[PDB]
Amino acid sequence: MRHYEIVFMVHPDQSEQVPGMIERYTAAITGAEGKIHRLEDWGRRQLAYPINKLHKAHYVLMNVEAPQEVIDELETTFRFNDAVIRSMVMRTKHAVTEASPMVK
């Protein structure tokens, strides 16, 4: 449908709940007959600057080929969850599959 690139930033004390969040989000996409192309946890990572009075965050990259209606449902899940701090969804021209330069 519409290729999106989703990266979100988890509160680092909620790093344990991260694979529980990813499986729900994949089941949101694949349950809505969307594709998921790569899915790359980046772990805890030192922030460039302290967002929200704290210095580290847990990064997750996720590439998604879903219809635009369920992504807008997915964005509200990032908005009201307090575990995720920042979320960025970026529309992509195609489906990307190659590993990240920092997964390397």
Residues that bind other proteins (CB under 8 A): 7, 9, 47-51, 57, 61, 80, 86, 88, 90, 100-102
> Which listed option, RNA, other proteins, none, makes contact with residue 44 (CB within 5 to 8 Å by class)?
none
> Which listed option, RNA, other proteins, none, makes contact with residue 27 (CB within 5 to 8 Å by class)?
none
User: What minimum distance in Å lies between the beta carbon of 19 and other proteins?
Assistant: 21
> Which listed option, RNA, other proteins, none, makes contact with residue 18 (CB within 5 to 8 Å by class)?
none
User: What minimum distance in Å lies between the beta carbon of 61 and RNA?
Assistant: 15
Q: 3-state SS string over the chain? A: CEEEEEEEEECHHHCCCHHHHHHHHHHHHHHCCCEEEEEEEEEEEEEEEEECCEEEEEEEEEEEEECHHHHHHHHHHHHHCCCEEEEEEEECCCCCCCCCCCCC
User: What minimum distance in Å lies between the beta carbon of 1 and RNA?
Assistant: 9
